[PDB]
Design a protein around this ligand. Structure first.
Ligand code: A1EE3
Length: 147
């Protein structure tokens, strides 16, 4: 039917069908289009109190809850999708990863290097595509595949 991980769903508010990916947590109205040894991705990380290391260059001690972190992630996705803000701009200002200094860019990587939820979502994206919330032991991520 559809590319890896995509399924059909019904909207509760409109009754219109949409498409959802259970590997990347992306969702969209339009039917999705169309594996490599390496991919290149940026990300924006929001840490929380249950993060493996509850510390970032932005905050010496992170206090926010997992639920607050997810609401922050949700709002950033909104601004990116509406075009009010660029992914790169929000990653530079707000990512709790030190890669914020390079606009969220992590370079190219193979399977076997990143935490598995991150790796799975990164390899299920197509070039140019962005994920929904992705959960790992570091926090909550938005992943953008660039190559
Ligand atoms: C490299 C690096 C920083 N971070 C990337 C996403 S992760 O979830 O694989 C944990 C490590």
């Amino acid at each position: 039917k559809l590319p890896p991980g995509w399924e059909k769903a019904m909207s509760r508010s409109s009754g219109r069908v949409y498409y959802f990916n259970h590997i990347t947590n992306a969702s969209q109205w339009e039917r999705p289009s169309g594996e490599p040894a390496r991919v290149r991705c940026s990300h924006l990380l929001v840490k929380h109190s249950q993060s493996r290391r509850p510390s970032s260059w932005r905050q010496e001690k992170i206090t926010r809850t997992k639920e607050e972190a997810l609401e922050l992630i949700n709002g950033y996705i909104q601004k990116i999708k509406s075009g009010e803000e660029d992914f790169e701009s929000l990653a530079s200002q707000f990512s709790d990863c030190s890669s914020a200094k390079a606009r969220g860019d992590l370079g190219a990587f193979s399977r076997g290097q990143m935490q598995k939820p991150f790796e799975d979502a990164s390899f299920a994206l197509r070039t140019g595509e962005m994920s929904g919330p992705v959960f790992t032991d570091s926090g909550i991520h938005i992943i953008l595949r660039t190559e």
